[PDB]
């Protein structure tokens with residue numbers, strides 16, 4: 001009810017980010033949503049003395065038919081002061097990723113109940129553009145904590161902890177973790193029971209509300225305890241061709257950058273001479289032993305892997321074909337913190353870019369659950385293609401950072 | 417007296433840490449001073465400026481300029497310093513409407529709102545920074561000091577504040593009259609509709625009555641401007657649009673500047689004249705920027721210019737947008753990295769045209785450029801019409817399928833259909849996924865000495881075929897490519913090639929059909945001739961037979 005003073009970081013001005021082009025459907029959706037938000041006092045029209053801007057668009061959350069406004073506060077988030085005043089920061093819970101079920105709720109509507117520092121409001125300016133720029137874009141700023149701004153959960157946190165207290169006290173084994181507009185609620189209960197607890201939780205928020213959120217009813221269900229990883233595996237064959245052995249030596253050479261004791265001396269010796277690629281070469285005992293020793297090495301964890309919360313997470317993704325995608329998350333090269341593989345890319349059988357967008361969202365979700373932050377993606381796509389399309393397929397209320405890979409990596413082969 | 421609503425003031429600040437201007441007034445002749453005194457007395461009578469006391473420390477210089485072929489002086493208050501110190505504003509006009517996105521109108525009326533401009537007050541707290549001084553006759557009295565009460569012409573904030581003030585006033589009128597459009601440009605309002613002329617005139621009179629609520633008068637004697645309108649380099653007509661006349665000059669010789677201007681005109685023309693090309697003319701501007709330098713036109717540039725003159729020989733117009741219909745975009749390949757397109761709704765009635773040029777870079781292929789063109793057109797279409805056109809593309813569906821399923825990057829093009837108009841975009845070669853049984857295996861390698869630049873490239877095969885060639889003025893990377901080229905040259909129609917060159921793999925795996933490198937082009941030419949090629953990579957220096965032999969031969 002009283003505002004928390006907020007500032008930008010020293011020597012930084014507000015965001016001045018261009019609004020990208022919006023489709024007719026998204027403009028119409030935003031005009032309707034913002035007309036309502038304005039009537040409710042959440043946003044106010046602004047004049048030309050505010051030169052700031054942040055882009056806006058609209059999405060549909062997974063399994064919903066109602067449009068949701070999504071502001072891309074990435075620039076404002078980078079520019080906003082850090083919030084350690086009351087708490088150094090809320091230690092990320094390592095137990096969340098160990099729960100049988102985690103449900104993700106959109107609790108962002110709650111933020112609109114708290115007013116935003118009057119002196120900070122100008123930096124939240126955004127524009128609803130018109131088709132062909134025929135009419136002046138409709139300019140607004142926030143009067144209340146905005147969805148998607150990193151300051152919102154930080155300021156609302158004392159309120160959330162109090163709202164959730166009776167539920168936590170009644171359910172001490174439930175893990176609850178807030179990230180931006182998301183609430184992650186984890187338990188080890190039978191799913192039916194789990195859902196009932198989730199709905200109990202919604203009612204606390206609902207009860208508080210009437211003391212109606214458009215997307216709180218929804219629920220994105222995860223089962224992180226079953227998440228699957230991808231160790232390095234070598235082929236098991238009865239007939240090895242020269243080509244097969246060449247591929248194996250390549251893979252092992254690569255793996256030797258990750259694992260110390262890998263050897264290829266005896267395997268390389270098999271190919272002595274200048275042979276046809278399709279010629280079958282029997283493994284010698286010495287080569288079979290070296291292969292076996294390598295397989296054993298690859299069953300052990302990578303040495304010297306640790307998470308440092310002060311460093312960025314980096315995620316690489318490879319397109320493997322036939323709807324399959326591999327990925328790795330690391331902070332230091334060759335020190336993977338997680339690897340994975342997807343094939344279940346939903347409703348995108350003839351659309352690579354939709355598949356990649358879904359993959360990015362899934363990996364970001366995994367990252368939030370495991371470390372409580374988003375990775376910086378290295379995407380196997382041309383900038384222009386990605387930037388034209390990703391907003392068409394986006395269903396999350398956060399947005400990570402990304403860069404583009406323009407030269408094909410050889411590594412694709414080693415995760416295939 | 418009928419009460420009028422005030423125009424809400426925009427609060428204005430200087431930039432952080434900046435104070436207002438304190439600029440010396442220049443001396444003026446007695447004649448100029450008398451002129452400025454008269455002009456300012458009238459502005460004062462009109463409420464535009466007010467005399468101020470001696471306490472205000474700010475100043476901006478004022479000048480008197482002679483209105484050509486006249487005995488009348490004009491004042492000029494030079495706000496350059498104040499402008500440097502004034503905050504940034506939101507500028508609504510940055511993106512201008514494209515004519516092709518406009519809708520046909522029966523009537524468009526122009527209303528002069530230049531007088532309204534002076535009912536927009538300047539923020540009281542900012543007025544002090546606009547102070548100026550008329551020097552006194554013979555410097556024998558204090559100069560007459562004034563500040564502005566209204567938006568000064570030439571001040572940084574005036575256009576944004578005027579426009580925003582007018583928009584705020586016009587909003588309710590527009591919202592409650594959805595059967596008209598209103599557009600402000602400079603000192604005029606343009607009001608368009610499809611109403612019968614009597615009703616359109618009624619709406620204009622209603623707009624005039626609305627504006628009077630703020631005491632804003634418009635001229636009874638109707639505007640001299642009427643369609644067609646010359647606006648932002650276009651001609652707008654009630655039911656079609658075009659660019660203003662494009663006249664390419666005749667010259668006996670061309671300078672850098674002439675050519676920059678020529679390409680500029682052609683670029684502007686290309687939004688409605690189909691098929692305009694600028695590659696060969698733009699190549700002439702490479703690297704050099706001495707505007708007076710004379711550049712001889714290449715034969716290729718002369719041909720391009722002649723082709724453009726033929727395209728421009730007579731007027732072409734676009735139609736406006738009918739939101740009830742789909743948009744269709746058709747693209748053609750023109751050669752040398754050039755692409756052209758048309759956007760239409762009904763056959764043979766383009767809304768607009770345009771072009772795309774290949775990006776600068778080492779290697780490329782036609783499918784990638786087509787994809788890029790599609791993305792450009794998509795984004796342009798979202799801006800102008802708020803939707804993606806259906807595409808008609810010169811690439812077979814099977815070609816596209818093969819491309820995207822096998823390409824290492826994610827890629828997508830939106831709903832499209834094949835149009836069989838050559839030249840068609842195709843895939844020129846396709847590497848094998850698996851080694852070829854019965855095909856000879858060539859182990860290739862190259863090396864160069866970094867000091868002498870001497871090197872060697874070659875191969876050894878499982879049939880005992882071998883070759884090493886000594887090379888001059890070369891590099892490790894070039895020798896690695898040369899070795900692959902030799903293997904392609906010397907092999908049959910099916911071939912397995914084993915390389916340790918990560919560089920060469922990175923290139924070939926990108927699937928180029930054209931390169932800035934002649935060597936890469938030679939490799940591409942060979943690949944096109946082959947029936948089957950499998951390219952295998954191995955790590956260098958790892959004891960791999962074949963590889964180890966050839967490495968020794970070329971590193972010697």
Ligand SMILES: Cc1cc(/C=C/C#N)cc(C)c1Nc1ccnc(Nc2ccc(C#N)cc2)n1
Pocket residue numbers: 134513517518519520521524597598599601606607608643644645646647652653654655
């Ligand atoms: C952008 C714009 C520039 C001018 C004029 C600028 C100037 N000078 C006049 C108008 C009315 C507009 N606004 C819109 C909006 C939607 N459709 C149209 N169609 C439209 C406009 C003019 C003519 C004509 N003749 C025909 C159709 N105009």
Ligand SMILES: [Mg+2]
Pocket residue numbers: 861862863956967971
């Ligand atoms: Mg070598």
